Amino acid sequence: KVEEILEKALELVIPDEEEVRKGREAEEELRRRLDELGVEYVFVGSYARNTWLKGSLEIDVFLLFPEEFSKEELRERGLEIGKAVLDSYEHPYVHGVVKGVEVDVVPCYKLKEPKNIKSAVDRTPFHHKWLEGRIKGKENEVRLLKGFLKANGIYGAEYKVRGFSGYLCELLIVFYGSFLETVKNARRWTRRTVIDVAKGEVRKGEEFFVVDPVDEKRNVAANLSLDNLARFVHLCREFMEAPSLGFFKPKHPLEIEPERLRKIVEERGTAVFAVKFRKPDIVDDNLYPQLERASRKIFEFLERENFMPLRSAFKASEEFCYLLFECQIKEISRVFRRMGPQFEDERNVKKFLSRNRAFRPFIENGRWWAFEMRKFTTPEEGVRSYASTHWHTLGKNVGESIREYFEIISGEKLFKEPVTAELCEMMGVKD
């Protein structure tokens, strides 16, 4: 059964004649442009090992340079070989297109093996060398892994996904031999599982760690979040229990009507709202970590102010960002208890009592307390206040945007914004 499912899964993960066509054209051409210049380079991507997922074609070329320091020559070479170009940020590289195919031209040292100068980009060539000879023949196993992860939103080590990188997928296929064996054993991974590829061993450690065979101190699964690891383990246990081709297919967007959402929310009886603001002009890897931090600070504020947040989420559209929240408390009393000093402190007590208040302070369990008034009674009002004077804690660029402008939105108005998918997921809505 399973083998039959994996067989049909291949038709979803293995590229196609018309994209294996573009990659074969752009490659020859790129070599021609690189050779004429007499450049030293090496293709090192998923493309270079035919392990790239269907529809995800892209080429990675690393230019090799000695022991000198400013490879602004790369800026030069790339621009001179790529039909179109862009500078993506020791991180600046050329990204463009050649014969229609996306290409990355990156600056590294033709290092006579492991040492890596201010390593990062310099490791990429060894990663390729280490894999090239071990992955041969299992290309499609890698593809099944990638396709499986992707269909479930966990392929990609970028901050927006915090999932499994392509490289991590190839080390795993190499360690276990195949996609199936990988999932079968991933059913027993724990948050303390250490997969040491170079030593062919699995042990227990401090956190989930997949030792890079090229550099033992590096955790290849550094960006995989604890929760996406958990989801993969659970997915594996589910697939083996009942394999289905559906695990290799994107789930379909819960086409939900605003009136059905209003009904779910009034039925849950919670306060559902979002903070809307202009999306700052920064790259995803910079934006997402700020959206996560801004969402956590606001959640912590809601917890502290006793609005009992249930869950939060965020969304980045083309022009705006949204921080979504759901709280168990829609309204809290205007009066609250303010803690005073122990009865023994004559001086501080006199001070605590000198303040004018609508009600009389009192002693309880040896300490003075006073009833005082809150400056807001709903989580929406609480957040309007917080976002107005504590935007500095919400990330450098996200906070600056909120400082210029933001609005708290709820109800139908909220349902009209492009955040319905996030809302449904946040509340666990099902079809």
Of 216 and 331, which CB lies nearer to ligand CTP in the complex structure?
Answer: 216
* Candidate segments 50-58, 262-270, 307-315, 396-404, binder of ligand CTP by CB under 6 A: 50-58
Query: Minimum distance between the CB of residue 59 and Mg ion, rounded to whole angstroms?
Result: 7
Query: Minimum distance between the CB of residue 14 and ligand CTP, rounded to whole angstroms?
Result: 11
Q: Which residues on adjacent β-strands are paired with residue 200?
A: none
Distance CA 387, CA 299 (A): 12
Binding residues for CTP: 46, 49, 127, 146, 155
Q: Which residue is nearest to ligand CTP (CB)?
A: 166
Among ligand CTP, Mg ion, none, partner that 165 touches (CB below 5 to 8 angstroms by kind): ligand CTP
Distance CA 194, CA 162 (A): 18
Binding residues: 46, 49, 58, 60, 104, 127, 146, 155
Binder among 52, 93, 164, 391 for ligand CTP (CB under 6 A): 52
Question: Judged by CB under 6 A, how many residues of this single chain contact ligand CTP?
Answer: 15
Distance CA 66, CA 103 (A): 23
Binder among 15, 23, 45, 107 for Mg ion (CB under 5 A): 45
Binder among 29, 58, 292, 417 for Mg ion (CB under 5 A): 58
* Candidate segments 80-88, 119-127, 132-140, 236-244, binder of ligand CTP by CB under 6 A: 119-127
List the one residue out of 274, 231, 222, 281 whose CA is nearest residue 416. Answer: 274
Q: For 335-345, give one letter per residue: b (16+ CB within 10 A) or e.
A: eeeeebeeeee
Provide the phi-psi class of 335: left if phi over 0, else alpha when psi is between -120 and 50, else beta.
beta
Binder among 27, 30, 39, 56 for ligand CTP (CB under 6 A): 56
* Candidate segments 28-36, 54-62, 84-92, 395-403, binder of ligand CTP by CB under 6 A: 54-62
Q: Which residues on adjacent β-strands are paired with residue 62?
A: 42, 106
Distance CA 163, CA 206 (A): 19
Query: Minimum distance between the CB of residue 161 and ligand CTP, rounded to whole angstroms?
Result: 11
Q: Restricting to residues 18-47, name those near ligand CTP by CB under 6 A.
A: 44-46
- Residues ≥6 apart with Cβ < 8 Å to 201: none
CB-based contact 44:60 (threshold 8 Å): yes
Of 58 and 345, which CB lies nearer to ligand CTP in the complex structure?
Answer: 58
DSSP string for 35-77: HHTT--EEE-SSGGGT-PPTT---EEEEEE--S-S--HHHHHH
The position carrying tokens 């450098």 is 396
Q: Restricting to residues 141-160, name those near ligand CTP by CB under 6 A.
A: 146
Binder among 27, 60, 102, 122 for Mg ion (CB under 5 A): 60
- Residues ≥6 apart with Cβ < 8 Å to 87: 75, 93, 94, 95
Longest distance between any two alpha carbons in the chain, whole Å? 89
Binding residues for Mg(2+): 58, 60, 104
Query: Would you tell me how many other CB atoms lie within 10 Å of the CB of residue 267?
Result: 8
* Candidate segments 57-65, 173-181, 332-340, 391-399, binder of Mg ion by CB under 5 A: 57-65
Of 196 and 381, which CB lies nearer to ligand CTP in the complex structure?
Answer: 196
| Residue 46 touches Mg ion, criterion: CB under 5 A | yes
Of 84 and 353, which CB lies nearer to Mg ion in the complex structure?
Answer: 84
CB-based contact 82:36 (threshold 8 Å): no
Query: Would you tell me how many other CB atoms lie within 10 Å of the CB of residue 84?
Result: 11
Of 121 and 324, which CB lies nearer to Mg ion in the complex structure?
Answer: 121
Binder among 116, 140, 165, 219 for ligand CTP (CB under 6 A): 165
Total length of the chain: 431
Distance CA 123, CA 135 (A): 18
Chain residues that interact with ligand CTP, rule: CB under 6 A? 44-46, 52-53, 56, 58, 60, 123-124, 127, 146, 165-167
